[PDB]
Design a protein around this ligand. Structure first.
Ligand SMILES: C=CC1=C(C)/C(=C/C2=NC(=C\c3[nH]c(/C=C4\NC(=O)C(C)=C4CC)c(C)c3CCC(=O)O)/C(CCC(=O)O)=C2C)NC1=O
Length: 177
């Protein structure tokens, strides 16, 4: 039902920029969180923030880039396999995702300190990040951020985010057509 609302809003506009803005706004409102971003990969899997919806008086990320050396060296990393990156608390680590769900038997995996520092540089304290695919080409990332506090991500939220990213990818594909 939440997904149907998002898809309805996405298809009630025509151009890709309106689709991006509506998408980030609707995801941010639905999750009641502080930032949702659409991030576009460059050819080297560095990338730039294209659209954002923020709430709570945070710095704007649109216009800025994040040049992640790991994503560059691994050409998009786990996102080439459409695995999400789910971190309730950037200081405690990621929730293990296996067979399309959380592995509740595994402890959280701490992040590398320079990754944590990059996230701090973007004012992030919690992140759920999923791939945007244009066809089978990895195009970018859809990120849900909490800035003021950790936030618990459940698997239904990550699945929703992935379905929204599917819709974004379809919109990008149709715009490129
Ligand atoms: C909105 C877009 C967005 C980006 C770009 C982003 C960055 C990311 N960097 C990652 C990994 C990632 N990143 C780094 C390290 C760094 N990263 C740096 O920027 C710097 C300076 C370092 C120090 C070398 C490392 C070592 C990893 C591997 C996993 C980890 O150690 O946490 C990951 C996990 C991907 C994976 O594990 O395969 C993401 C999602 N998160 C987002 O939401």
């Amino acid at each position: 039902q939440a997904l149907n609302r998002v898809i309805t809003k996405i298809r009630q506009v025509s151009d890709l920029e309106s689709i991006f803005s509506t998408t980030t706004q609707e995801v941010r409102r639905l999750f009641g969180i502080e930032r949702v971003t659409i991030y576009k990969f460059r050819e080297d899997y560095f990338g730039d923030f294209i659209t954002e919806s923020e709430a709570g008086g945070w710095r704007k990320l649109v216009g800025s880039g994040w040049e992640d050396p790991y994503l560059n060296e691994h050409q998009g990393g786990r996102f080439q396999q459409n695995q999400p990156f789910v971190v309730d608390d950037i200081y405690l680590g990621e929730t293990i995702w296996e067979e399309g769900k959380f592995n509740l038997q595994k402890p959280k995996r701490p992040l590398t300190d320079c990754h944590i520092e990059a996230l701090e540089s973007f004012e992030v304290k919690s992140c759920a990040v999923v791939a945007i695919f244009q066809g089978q080409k990895l195009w970018g990332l859809l990120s849900a951020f909490q800035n003021s506090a950790p936030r618990h991500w459940d698997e239904a939220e990550v699945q929703l985010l992935m379905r929204v990213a599917d819709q974004l990818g379809v919109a990008i594909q149709q715009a490129e057509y």
